[PDB]
Design an enzyme around this catalytic site. Structure first.
Site, PDB file in Angstrom:
ATOM      1  CB  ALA A  67      -0.861   0.185   1.237  1.00  0.00           C
TER       2      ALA A  67
ATOM      3  CB  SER B   5      -0.996  -2.931   2.739  1.00  0.00           C
ATOM      4  OG  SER B   5      -0.084  -2.504   3.607  1.00  0.00           O
TER       5      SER B   5
ATOM      6  N   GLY C 126      11.823  15.668  -1.640  1.00  0.00           N
ATOM      7  CA  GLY C 126      10.981  15.944  -2.964  1.00  0.00           C
ATOM      8  C   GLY C 126      11.021  15.065  -4.044  1.00  0.00           C
TER       9      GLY C 126
ATOM     10  CG  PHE D 214      16.906  17.405  -2.547  1.00  0.00           C
ATOM     11  CD1 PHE D 214      16.506  18.815  -1.894  1.00  0.00           C
ATOM     12  CD2 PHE D 214      17.131  16.134  -1.745  1.00  0.00           C
ATOM     13  CE1 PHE D 214      16.261  18.891  -0.538  1.00  0.00           C
ATOM     14  CE2 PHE D 214      16.909  16.310  -0.268  1.00  0.00           C
ATOM     15  CZ  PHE D 214      16.247  17.496   0.166  1.00  0.00           C
TER      16      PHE D 214
ATOM     17  CG  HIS E 188      -5.564  -9.256   4.864  1.00  0.00           C
ATOM     18  ND1 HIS E 188      -6.229  -8.553   5.169  1.00  0.00           N
ATOM     19  CD2 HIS E 188      -6.058 -10.196   4.286  1.00  0.00           C
ATOM     20  CE1 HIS E 188      -7.446  -9.114   5.596  1.00  0.00           C
ATOM     21  NE2 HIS E 188      -7.317 -10.245   4.786  1.00  0.00           N
TER      22      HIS E 188
ATOM     23  CB  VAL F 214       1.282 -11.469   0.544  1.00  0.00           C
ATOM     24  CG1 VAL F 214       1.375 -12.366  -0.647  1.00  0.00           C
ATOM     25  CG2 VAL F 214       0.057 -10.537   0.367  1.00  0.00           C
TER      26      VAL F 214
ATOM     27  CG  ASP G  14       8.089  -9.135   3.722  1.00  0.00           C
ATOM     28  OD1 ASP G  14       9.197  -9.207   4.273  1.00  0.00           O
ATOM     29  OD2 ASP G  14       7.077  -8.589   4.424  1.00  0.00           O
TER      30      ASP G  14
ATOM     31  CD  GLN H  64      21.605   6.609  -2.687  1.00  0.00           C
ATOM     32  OE1 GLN H  64      21.164   7.588  -2.791  1.00  0.00           O
ATOM     33  NE2 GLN H  64      21.926   6.005  -4.011  1.00  0.00           N
TER      34      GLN H  64
ATOM     35  CG  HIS I 137      20.927  10.214   4.092  1.00  0.00           C
ATOM     36  ND1 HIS I 137      20.285  10.720   3.151  1.00  0.00           N
ATOM     37  CD2 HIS I 137      21.353  11.026   5.124  1.00  0.00           C
ATOM     38  CE1 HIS I 137      20.221  12.163   3.310  1.00  0.00           C
ATOM     39  NE2 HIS I 137      20.900  12.377   4.712  1.00  0.00           N
TER      40      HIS I 137
ATOM     41  CG  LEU J  86      16.727  11.224   6.260  1.00  0.00           C
ATOM     42  CD1 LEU J  86      17.710  10.728   5.435  1.00  0.00           C
ATOM     43  CD2 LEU J  86      15.446  11.293   5.410  1.00  0.00           C
TER      44      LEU J  86
ATOM     45  CD  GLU K  76      21.738  15.963  -0.582  1.00  0.00           C
ATOM     46  OE1 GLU K  76      22.069  14.719  -0.183  1.00  0.00           O
ATOM     47  OE2 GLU K  76      21.633  16.102  -1.850  1.00  0.00           O
TER      48      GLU K  76
ATOM     49  NE  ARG L  55      22.405  11.122  -1.073  1.00  0.00           N
ATOM     50  CZ  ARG L  55      20.974  11.128  -1.073  1.00  0.00           C
ATOM     51  NH1 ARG L  55      20.130  10.205  -1.465  1.00  0.00           N
ATOM     52  NH2 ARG L  55      20.523  12.279  -0.634  1.00  0.00           N
TER      53      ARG L  55
ATOM     54  CG  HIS M 259      18.427   6.372   2.504  1.00  0.00           C
ATOM     55  ND1 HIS M 259      17.776   6.915   3.458  1.00  0.00           N
ATOM     56  CD2 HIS M 259      18.176   6.846   1.252  1.00  0.00           C
ATOM     57  CE1 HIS M 259      16.997   7.705   2.981  1.00  0.00           C
ATOM     58  NE2 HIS M 259      17.158   7.414   1.574  1.00  0.00           N
TER      59      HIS M 259
ATOM     60  NE  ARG N 180      17.311   7.185  -4.067  1.00  0.00           N
ATOM     61  CZ  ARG N 180      16.631   7.945  -3.504  1.00  0.00           C
ATOM     62  NH1 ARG N 180      15.390   8.270  -3.876  1.00  0.00           N
ATOM     63  NH2 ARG N 180      16.651   8.623  -2.329  1.00  0.00           N
TER      64      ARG N 180
ATOM     65  N   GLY O 165      19.362  11.541  -5.994  1.00  0.00           N
ATOM     66  CA  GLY O 165      18.519  12.074  -4.797  1.00  0.00           C
ATOM     67  C   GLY O 165      17.198  12.716  -5.574  1.00  0.00           C
ATOM     68  CB  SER O 166      14.637  14.305  -5.274  1.00  0.00           C
ATOM     69  OG  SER O 166      14.967  14.889  -6.478  1.00  0.00           O
TER      70      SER O 166
HETATM   71  C1  LIG Z   1      13.714   8.693   5.286  1.00  0.00           C
HETATM   72  C2  LIG Z   1      13.691   8.445   3.907  1.00  0.00           C
HETATM   73  C3  LIG Z   1      13.697   9.716   3.313  1.00  0.00           C
HETATM   74  C4  LIG Z   1      13.338   9.499   1.709  1.00  0.00           C
HETATM   75  N1  LIG Z   1      13.473  10.570   1.145  1.00  0.00           N
HETATM   76  C5  LIG Z   1      13.161  10.614  -0.396  1.00  0.00           C
HETATM   77  C6  LIG Z   1      13.064  11.800  -1.088  1.00  0.00           C
HETATM   78  O1  LIG Z   1      13.066  12.891  -0.551  1.00  0.00           O
HETATM   79  N2  LIG Z   1      12.931  11.672  -2.445  1.00  0.00           N
HETATM   80  C7  LIG Z   1      12.967  10.656  -3.103  1.00  0.00           C
HETATM   81  O2  LIG Z   1      13.029  10.444  -4.342  1.00  0.00           O
HETATM   82  N3  LIG Z   1      13.032   9.249  -2.302  1.00  0.00           N
HETATM   83  C8  LIG Z   1      13.391   9.462  -0.871  1.00  0.00           C
HETATM   84  N4  LIG Z   1      13.470   8.231  -0.316  1.00  0.00           N
HETATM   85  C9  LIG Z   1      12.970   6.814  -0.812  1.00  0.00           C
HETATM   86  C10 LIG Z   1      11.725   6.627  -1.240  1.00  0.00           C
HETATM   87  O3  LIG Z   1      10.738   7.367  -0.565  1.00  0.00           O
HETATM   88  C11 LIG Z   1      11.315   5.176  -1.031  1.00  0.00           C
HETATM   89  O4  LIG Z   1      12.028   4.175  -1.780  1.00  0.00           O
HETATM   90  C12 LIG Z   1       9.877   5.006  -1.440  1.00  0.00           C
HETATM   91  O5  LIG Z   1       8.941   5.411  -0.565  1.00  0.00           O
HETATM   92  C13 LIG Z   1       9.508   3.472  -1.777  1.00  0.00           C
HETATM   93  O6  LIG Z   1       8.207   3.264  -2.199  1.00  0.00           O
HETATM   94  P1  LIG Z   1       7.433   2.144  -2.440  1.00  0.00           P
HETATM   95  O7  LIG Z   1       6.067   2.175  -2.635  1.00  0.00           O
HETATM   96  O8  LIG Z   1       8.046   1.073  -3.419  1.00  0.00           O
HETATM   97  O9  LIG Z   1       7.524   1.262  -0.864  1.00  0.00           O
HETATM   98  P2  LIG Z   1       6.690   1.698   0.212  1.00  0.00           P
HETATM   99  O10 LIG Z   1       6.067   3.019   0.426  1.00  0.00           O
HETATM  100  O11 LIG Z   1       7.597   1.372   1.603  1.00  0.00           O
HETATM  101  O12 LIG Z   1       5.608   0.474   0.189  1.00  0.00           O
HETATM  102  C14 LIG Z   1       5.466  -0.860   1.300  1.00  0.00           C
HETATM  103  C15 LIG Z   1       4.182  -1.158   1.514  1.00  0.00           C
HETATM  104  O13 LIG Z   1       4.325  -2.586   0.966  1.00  0.00           O
HETATM  105  C16 LIG Z   1       3.565  -3.460   2.031  1.00  0.00           C
HETATM  106  N5  LIG Z   1       4.284  -4.891   2.332  1.00  0.00           N
HETATM  107  C17 LIG Z   1       5.358  -5.147   2.458  1.00  0.00           C
HETATM  108  N6  LIG Z   1       5.600  -6.556   2.652  1.00  0.00           N
HETATM  109  C18 LIG Z   1       4.215  -7.079   2.768  1.00  0.00           C
HETATM  110  C19 LIG Z   1       3.608  -8.256   2.594  1.00  0.00           C
HETATM  111  N7  LIG Z   1       4.509  -9.377   3.005  1.00  0.00           N
HETATM  112  N8  LIG Z   1       2.416  -8.316   2.617  1.00  0.00           N
HETATM  113  C20 LIG Z   1       1.539  -7.486   2.114  1.00  0.00           C
HETATM  114  N9  LIG Z   1       1.875  -6.070   2.338  1.00  0.00           N
HETATM  115  C21 LIG Z   1       3.229  -5.884   2.474  1.00  0.00           C
HETATM  116  C22 LIG Z   1       3.630  -2.648   3.195  1.00  0.00           C
HETATM  117  O14 LIG Z   1       2.313  -2.614   4.124  1.00  0.00           O
HETATM  118  C23 LIG Z   1       3.525  -1.154   2.777  1.00  0.00           C
HETATM  119  O15 LIG Z   1       2.070  -0.809   2.357  1.00  0.00           O
HETATM  120  C24 LIG Z   1      13.345   8.136   1.248  1.00  0.00           C
HETATM  121  C25 LIG Z   1      13.341   7.088   2.058  1.00  0.00           C
HETATM  122  C26 LIG Z   1      13.484   7.237   3.285  1.00  0.00           C
HETATM  123  C27 LIG Z   1      13.706   5.941   4.155  1.00  0.00           C
END
Ligand SMILES: Cc1cc2nc3c(=O)[nH]c(=O)nc-3n(C[C@H](O)[C@H](O)[C@H](O)COP(=O)(O)OP(=O)(O)OC[C@H]3O[C@@H](n4cnc5c(N)ncnc54)[C@H](O)[C@@H]3O)c2cc1C
Ligand code: SF4
Ligand code: F3S
Ligand code: FES
Lengths: 243, 119, 577, 130
Positions: free
Chosen positions: C13, C37, C52, C117, C156, C158, C212, C231, C233, C243, C246, C288, C356, C391, C393-394
């Site tokens: 989610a 999720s 951002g 950034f 839930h 998986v 997972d 990566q 940070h 965190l 930046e 970085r 990170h 990667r 940044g941003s």
């Molecule tokens: C502190 C921090 C700051 C950041 N800042 C930036 C930024 O400024 N700019 C930028 O570009 N990037 C940034 N990033 C990186 C970026 O935000 C993340 O890589 C990004 O949010 C990943 O999105 P996603 O939807 O792939 O993962 P997530 O948003 O983490 O999605 C995880 C989802 O998967 C679900 N899930 C996991 N395992 C299961 C399972 N077994 N069964 C069911 N559901 C499951 C969880 O419930 C959750 O809903 C940052 C990261 C961090 C940690």
């Protein structure tokens, strides 16, 4: 190297075994930086693998951290053992049904949040025409209320919601107010019905303890008052409404 | 679990008067309780200022006719509206509470309107 | 097991997952979409991002500039045709987010403001104050409510996906509150499980980020790509790893040793810039990798301050002032005061490098499709070929909404033309998932999962830091293998059905161990230094475009061993140099 | 059959005693009693002043009673608490932006106290001096 100890009281409940919640005490080492969330972890790993709780971010931004600490709504995430030197008692988040240990049923919340339609309504602009125009001034209208993280802390704090479960609640009204006051939103009439209800804004008696417990300084109590004024305005217009 | 179509609350009306009743009372009540409550019966006032004769002269006049009314009526609506909620806050069950409290308000409001037109 | 019907199922989610749901619901109004999720959607880790989202907006900017920035920054391990698609769809996607009600910060004229950034020359990053990740997720989530197509399985878990004859046909999941098992049958599945950061001992990641999604892909013979690229940070709090954005450096904050000497001038990042006037690519706005490495260099010299929570460098910001902090950096202040007992008005904040982001992930083609027909990966758990060796940044947030949309749209096409699989075989495949669950519960031998967790983290921390040696990489490989055998002697002492996290965390540790082994073998096998992956042994100090300009592919076989293959890199318009 | 049995904690009538915050709220609402009481007394006065000089004289002798002075003293203390609290809360009703920042309730609390201060004297002046 030696770390100081603390006896923590945790209120446990198992639907399989327990009739009601009962207390359990744990000796947990702490220092100046130890958060309640850290301490809960320590118990799970070493003292009791059967303890359950919710958490993720570790930094008071996700909001899944809600619980009671000496009858006070706090996020374990940001609660520090250094403060509770005399004694510490951890209950599940108040005004909510206890599913297990520190895990609560938060359906009503999500559902209240759903009911108010918290999304842009009736703006026909499309992507290939560029963004809307909104001034920093126009933004400051709703900005503070947009920063809510659905912790639930305010619902536990609100006496009225304690007395009435049906009441849609502070967080929910606040979010409804957020879109109402958004310059890009044309769905004001869509969510007034809920707010005008007795279970709407008219269940708040302006206690104001919800604003006091908010970790993200939303000040939801102000959103409600503005909501009451807006509802009154609507009531007036609606009285002269036989067109 | 949540009603799609809820009934519009009649609350804005009672709340409306409550707001004005609260404001009038916050602004003018202190000085009034001082005059009527303390100054008059302790006799701490210069000469013939709060004598039957002078108080009546103000009372009968149109300005004091409106004033006395508002000083009595408005704070009641504020006060009573609050007690109605105190009952619900104390988990005390009062039958037809709504009608009871605002009923009282309306009665006295009438009694006063009657009073200020002279008897 | 209760069974469910759905046109497609999205696991996760997070920001990408939600974007995919919305996209699919618009591509087909009549679709039935399952959004699964393990947490409530708003708790996904995307909520934690502060900096951002990169998208081109300025008159004097160009898509070529953003393209070149990313390819060069990824150190030429980027699928250039993918990067091209990416840059061109950022404006469209960010604008769409504004249209749904994301409170992007604005210029006085009411237009959208951008800030700098990730080392880019032209500042093209859109930002929702300091809460960009929180705002993007909550905007995406609240919008998804208007679509009745999306059915959400909150909390839930998986366990595995359902495959037969090279096609996906559904999945198995557990209702967390009930502890009951359910089947969901869909002819297309999207993986959005985030990265694997939690496999390291010290990280910036939320608890849920356990690897997972990748762990399931592996078990079905899908390779993980470029897993060695991790990566760090440069500035996270000690012990907790929290965190520090930046943005702090972006406002002109400084990094200093125990001697308060700005150390960055020593490593070619000189000359020292005036306090008020911070310049991009110099000193604190240096790359970085370089800044991260520099800490390690200063650590070796005995120049780092030693705390009961580790060796630290100081980011001084108290020389900034009250009014400056509150407009763009107010969150950071409140973190500092609480977690390390530090007021960025009065005193210095202890910070250090911290694990990170996961550049690697499930292998995907230009469509986000895996080798298994009907299976998609998007977001941090995936490897589309955008980030390469490092990667920018941003760009991660930007990817989520851009590739989330594409993932969602392509899966809707694949679902419609899928046809029907063998009913008996799929059912049998799901029976075997349940049997595998019962098997873990029956397991006995008195190993505490927690102690195995702690040791893996330590191994990854020491084995796969910024700088890497064959001696230390092998030590880790060896450690993990020992732990793998140990995992088979764990007993889950809690047998309760209702919200049993003892069971969950133990399963999550499974996927972790598997994935860590993919990182470890890949890193060892790459005998060069490129981007995030840096080796110290002779002949591995420099990047080798002659032999190592290829993607690393990690396979886990049925016998439990990690095999490697290499895929070639696509280069459309910009040759390597 | 489900294995979960949700446990609901009750809510007593004495919920407000437990926390100091709630206690203050209770008290603030508790000002409504004397507020009604005073508004009552004025009815007595209006009618007693109407019945002639003899009846009004007895209405004054009622106020001369120590209990009435004491009960009225409490009434003034109550009115004063209402004022302090009302002025704190009302400003939270309007949401006004000055320039590009949402304005504080501090300037409004000031305005209200000033209006009370001037109103009090102006009234005391007319009442006593002439
Ligand atoms: C502190 C921090 C700051 C950041 N800042 C930036 C930024 O400024 N700019 C930028 O570009 N990037 C940034 N990033 C990186 C970026 O935000 C993340 O890589 C990004 O949010 C990943 O999105 P996603 O939807 O792939 O993962 P997530 O948003 O983490 O999605 C995880 C989802 O998967 C679900 N899930 C996991 N395992 C299961 C399972 N077994 N069964 C069911 N559901 C499951 C969880 O419930 C959750 O809903 C940052 C990261 C961090 C940690
Ligand atoms: S208003 Fe504040 S307390 Fe209430 S849910 Fe939102 S963040 Fe939590
Ligand atoms: S605590 Fe309750 S009563 Fe109204 S002021 Fe907040 S919703
Ligand atoms: S763990 Fe995210 S709010 Fe506490």
């Amino acid at each position: 190297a030696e770390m100081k100890n603390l006896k923590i009281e945790v209120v446990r409940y198992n639907p399989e075994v327990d009739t009601a919640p009962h207390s359990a005490f744990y000796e947990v080492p702490y220092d100046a930086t130890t958060s309640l969330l850290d301490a809960l972890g320590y118990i799970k790993d070493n003292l009791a693998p059967d303890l359950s709780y919710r958490w993720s971010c570790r930094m008071a931004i996700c909001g899944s951290c809600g619980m009671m600490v000496n009858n006070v709504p706090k996020l374990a995430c940001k609660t520090f053992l250094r403060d509770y030197t005399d004694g510490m008692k951890v209950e599940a988040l108040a005004n909510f049904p206890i599913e297990r240990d520190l895990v609560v049923d938060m359906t009503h919340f999500i559902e209240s949040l759903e009911a108010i339609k918290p999304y842009i309504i009736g703006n026909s602009r499309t992507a290939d025409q560029g963004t809307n125009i909104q001034t920093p001034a126009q933004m400051a209208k709703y900005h503070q209320f947009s920063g809510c993280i659905n912790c639930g802390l305010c619902y536990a704090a609100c006496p009225q919601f304690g007395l009435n479960p049906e009441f849609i609640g502070p967080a929910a009204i606040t979010l409804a107010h957020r879109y109402n006051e958004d310059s890009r939103d044309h769905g004001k009439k869509e969510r007034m019905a809920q707010l005008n209800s007795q279970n709407g804004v008219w269940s708040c008696t302006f206690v104001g303890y919800c604003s006091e417990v908010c970790p993200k300084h939303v000040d939801p109590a102000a959103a409600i008052q503005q909501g009451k004024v807006e509802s009154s305005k609507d009531f007036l217009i609606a009285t002269l409404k036989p067109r | 679990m949540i009603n799609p179509n809820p009934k519009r609350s009649d609350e804005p009306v009672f709340w409306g008067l409550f707001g004005a009743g609260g404001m009038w009372s916050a602004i003018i009540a202190p000085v009034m309780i001082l005059l009527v409550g303390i100054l008059l019966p302790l006799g701490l006032f210069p000469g013939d200022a709060l004598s039957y004769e002078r108080v009546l002269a103000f009372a009968q006049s149109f300005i004091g006719r409106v004033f006395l009314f508002l000083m009595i009526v408005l704070p009641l609506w504020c006060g009573l509206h609050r007690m109605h909620h105190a009952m619900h806050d104390l988990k005390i069950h009062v039958p037809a509470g709504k009608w009871v409290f605002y009923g009282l308000a309306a009665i006295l409001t009438v009694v006063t309107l009657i009073g200020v037109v002279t008897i | 097991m209760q069974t469910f019907q759905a046109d497609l199922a999205i696991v996760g989610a997070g920001g990408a997952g939600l974007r995919a749901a919305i996209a699919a619901a618009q591509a087909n109004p009549n679709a039935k979409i399952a959004l699964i999720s393990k947490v409530y959607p708003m708790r996904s880790h995307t909520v934690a991002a502060e900096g951002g989202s990169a998208a081109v907006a300025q008159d004097h900017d160009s898509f070529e500039y953003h393209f070149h920035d990313t390819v060069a920054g990824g150190d030429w391990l980027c699928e250039q045709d993918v990067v091209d698609y990416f840059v061109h769809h950022c404006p469209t996607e960010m604008t769409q987010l504004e249209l749904w009600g994301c409170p992007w910060s604005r210029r006085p004229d009411g237009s959208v403001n951008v800030r700098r950034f990730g080392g880019m020359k032209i500042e093209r990053t859109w930002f929702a104050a300091d809460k960009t990740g929180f705002h993007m997720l909550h905007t995406l989530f609240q919008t998804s409510l208007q679509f009745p197509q999306i059915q959400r399985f909150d909390e839930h878990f998986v366990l595995d996906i359902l495959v037969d004859d090279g096609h996906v046909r559904g999945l198995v999941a557990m209702n967390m509150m009930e502890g009951t098992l359910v089947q969901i049958r869909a002819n297309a599945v999207v993986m959005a499980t985030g990265g694997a950061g939690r496999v390291y001992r010290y990280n910036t990641n939320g608890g849920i980020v356990t690897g997972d999604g990748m762990g399931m892909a592996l078990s079905h013979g899908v390779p993980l790509r470029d897993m060695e690229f991790v990566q760090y940070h440069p500035t996270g709090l000690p012990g907790s790893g929290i965190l520090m954005t930046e943005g702090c450096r972006g406002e002109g904050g400084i990094l200093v040793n125990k001697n308060g000497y700005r150390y960055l001038q020593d490593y070619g990042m000189g000359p020292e810039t005036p306090l008020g006037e911070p310049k991009n690519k110099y000193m604190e706005l240096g790359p970085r990798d370089k800044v991260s490495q520099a800490f390690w260099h200063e650590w070796r010299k005995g120049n780092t301050i030693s705390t009961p929570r580790g060796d630290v460098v100081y980011l001084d910001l108290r020389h900034l002032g009250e009014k400056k902090l509150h407009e763009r950096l107010p969150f950071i202040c409140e973190l500092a005061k609480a977690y390390v007992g530090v007021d960025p008005v009065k005193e210095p904040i202890p910070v250090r490098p911290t694990a990170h982001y996961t550049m690697g992930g499930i292998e995907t083609d230009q469509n986000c499709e895996t080798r298994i027909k009907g299976l998609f990966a998007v977001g941090e758990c995936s490897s589309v070929g955008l980030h390469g060796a490092n990667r920018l940044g941003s760009n991660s947030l930007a990817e989520l909404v851009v590739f989330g949309r594409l993932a969602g749209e392509q899966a809707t096409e694949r679902a419609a033309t899928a046809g029907n699989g063998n009913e008996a075989a799929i059912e049998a495949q799901a029976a075997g998932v349940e049997q595998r669950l019962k098997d873990l519960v029956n397991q006995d031998g008195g190993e505490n999962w927690a102690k195995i967790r702690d040791e893996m983290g330590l191994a990854m921390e020491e084995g796969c830091g910024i700088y890497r040696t064959p001696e230390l990489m092998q030590k880790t490989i060896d450690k993990l293998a020992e732990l793998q055998e140990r995992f088979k002697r764990v007993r889950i002492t809690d047998t309760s059905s209702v919200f049993n996290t003892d069971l969950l965390y133990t399963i999550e540790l499974g996927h972790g161990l598997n994935v860590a082994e993919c990182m470890a073998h890949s890193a060892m096998a790459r005998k060069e230094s490129r981007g995030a992956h840096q080796r110290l042994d002779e002949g591995c100090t420099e990047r080798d475009d002659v032999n190592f300009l290829k993607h690393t592919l990690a396979f886990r076989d049925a016998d439990g061993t990690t095999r490697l293959e290499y895929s070639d890199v696509k280069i459309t318009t910009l040759p390597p140099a | 059959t489900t294995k979960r049995k949700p446990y609901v904690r009750p809510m007593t009538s004495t919920w407000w005693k437990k926390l100091p915050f709630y206690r203050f709220y209770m008290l603030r609402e508790g000002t409504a009693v004397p507020a009604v009481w005073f508004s009552i007394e004025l009815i007595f006065g209006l009618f007693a002043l109407k019945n002639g000089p003899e009846a009004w004289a007895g209405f004054v002798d009622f106020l001369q009673n120590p209990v009435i002075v004491i009960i009225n003293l409490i009434t003034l203390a109550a009115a004063l608490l209402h004022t302090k609290t009302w002025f704190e809360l009302a400003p939270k009703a309007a949401n006004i932006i000055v320039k590009d920042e949402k304005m504080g309730p501090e300037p409004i609390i000031k305005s209200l106290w000033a209006v009370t201060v001037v109103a009090t004297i102006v009234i005391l002046f007319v009442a006593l001096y002439w």
